[PDB]
Amino acid sequence: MAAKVFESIGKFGLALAVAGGVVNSALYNVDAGHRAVIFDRFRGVQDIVVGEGTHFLIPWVQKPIIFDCRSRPRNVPVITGSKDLQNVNITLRILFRPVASQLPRIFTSIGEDYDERVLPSITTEILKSVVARFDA
Amino acid sequence: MAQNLKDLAGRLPAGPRGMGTALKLLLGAGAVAYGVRESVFTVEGGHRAIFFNRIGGVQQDTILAEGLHFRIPWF
């Protein structure tokens, strides 16, 4: 009887360990001001942002995308011609933050890294246009 | 290599009459499972895929979102 009890205890312990591992693999820390998204495969990426909270998922389909809905600066240097057409090397400082609501579209459209492609783009465009318009 | 496989196949015990039927059913289930897996083109987040086909070239009227959308295997 003792051997059967020990075997059952071992089996239950192994099952509990497996369940705990599965549960652990289904969660990701959400540092305050982090709003993840679900990147699955049977749907791709869902339409619903993960708040700044611990929200569940299933394995091998989602790779925890722990976003950061906090603010960030950037410096854009632009060698712009002005109205009088000078070589104005303008480094603009820009503060920006994302929005918690529609992060899943942000991940689908671009992915995990988003700001680099756009910041120099629009900032240089607008600096060139505006300074071009305005005398040095 | 083939000789080893033949020896292994021969070494399998000649179980009861129902053992063969159970093995056949399990093999069919596994075949269906893999057909299901590779019959859904594994597209990733945000993407899409209409049927790039080898029958009828590639269709035009059928449109698919990202997710539950079945491929025909290798097709």
Curated annotation (Swiss-Prot), chain A:
Protein localization: Mitochondrion inner membrane; Nucleus; Cytoplasm; Cell membrane
Outcome recorded upon mutating V88A: In a breast cancer sample; somatic mutation
Stimuli inducing this protein: Expression increases approximately 3-fold upon entry into G1 phase compared with other phases of the cell cycle. Also induced following inhibition of mitochondrial protein synthesis by thiamphenicol.
Keyword terms, alphabetized: Acetylation, Cell membrane, Coiled coil, Cytoplasm, DNA synthesis, Host-virus interaction, Membrane, Mitochondrion, Mitochondrion inner membrane, Nucleus, Phosphoprotein, Proto-oncogene
Tissue and organ expression note: Widely expressed in different tissues.
Assembly and binders: The mitochondrial prohibitin complex consists of two subunits (PHB1 and PHB2), assembled into a membrane-associated ring-shaped supercomplex of approximately 1 mDa. Interacts with STOML2. Interacts with MAP1LC3B (membrane-bound form LC3-II); the interaction requires PHB2 and takes place upon Parkin-mediated mitochondrial damage. Interacts with STAT3 (unphosphorylated or phosphorylated at 'Ser-727'). Interacts with CLPB. Interacts with CD86 (via cytoplasmic domain); the interactions increases after priming with CD40.
Full-protein positions shown: 1 to 136 of 272
Gene Ontology cellular-component annotations: cell surface; cytoplasm; early endosome; extracellular exosome; membrane; mitochondrial inner membrane; mitochondrial prohibitin complex; mitochondrion
Record protein name field: Prohibitin 1
Residues with Phosphothreonine modification: T91
N-acetylalanine modification, residue list: A2
Presence of the UniProt keyword Cell membrane in the record: yes
Gene Ontology biological process terms in this record: antiviral innate immune response; B cell activation; cellular response to interleukin-6; DNA biosynthetic process; epigenetic regulation of gene expression; mitochondrion organization; modulation by host of viral RNA genome replication; negative regulation of androgen receptor signaling pathway
Organism: Homo sapiens
UniProt family annotation: Belongs to the prohibitin family.
Name of the gene: PHB1
Swiss-Prot record, chain B:
UniProt name for this protein: Prohibitin-2
Free-text note on domains in this protein's UniProt record: LC3-interaction region (LIR) is required for interaction with MAP1LC3B/LC3-II and for Parkin-mediated mitophagy.
Expression induction or repression: Expression increases approximately 3-fold upon entry into G1 phase compared to other phases of the cell cycle. Also induced following inhibition of mitochondrial protein synthesis by thiamphenicol.
Ranges where the record places region Necessary for transcriptional repression: 19-49
Family membership noted in the UniProt record: Belongs to the prohibitin family.
Organism: Homo sapiens (Human)
Functional summary from the UniProt entry: Protein with pleiotropic attributes mediated in a cell-compartment- and tissue-specific manner, which include the plasma membrane-associated cell signaling functions, mitochondrial chaperone, and transcriptional co-regulator of transcription factors and sex steroid hormones in the nucleus. In the mitochondria, together with PHB, forms large ring complexes (prohibitin complexes) in the inner mitochondrial membrane (IMM) and functions as a chaperone protein that stabilizes mitochondrial respiratory enzymes and maintains mitochondrial integrity in the IMM, which is required for mitochondrial morphogenesis, neuronal survival, and normal lifespan. The prohibitin complex, with DNAJC19, regulates cardiolipin remodeling and the protein turnover of OMA1 in a cardiolipin-binding manner. Also regulates cytochrome-c oxidase assembly (COX) and mitochondrial respiration.
Gene transcribed to yield this protein: PHB2
Molecular-function annotations in GO: amide binding; identical protein binding; nuclear estrogen receptor binding; protein heterodimerization activity; protein homodimerization activity; sphingolipid binding
Gene Ontology biological process: antiviral innate immune response; B cell activation; cell migration; estrogen receptor signaling pathway; mammary gland alveolus development; mammary gland branching involved in thelarche; mammary gland epithelial cell proliferation; mitochondrion organization
Subcellular location: Mitochondrion inner membrane; Cytoplasm; Nucleus; Cell membrane
Keywords, in A-Z order: Acetylation, Cell membrane, Coiled coil, Cytoplasm, Host-virus interaction, Membrane, Mitochondrion, Mitochondrion inner membrane, Nucleus, Phosphoprotein, Receptor, Repressor, Transcription, Transcription regulation
Top-rank taxon, per record: Eukaryota
GO cellular component: cell periphery; cell surface; cytoplasm; mitochondrial inner membrane; mitochondrial outer membrane; mitochondrial prohibitin complex; mitochondrion; nuclear matrix
Modifications after synthesis and translation: Phosphorylated. Tyrosine phosphorylation is indirectly stimulated by IGFBP6.
Tissue: Expressed in myoblasts.
Modified residues (N-acetylalanine): A2
Residue window of the full protein shown: 1 to 75 of 299
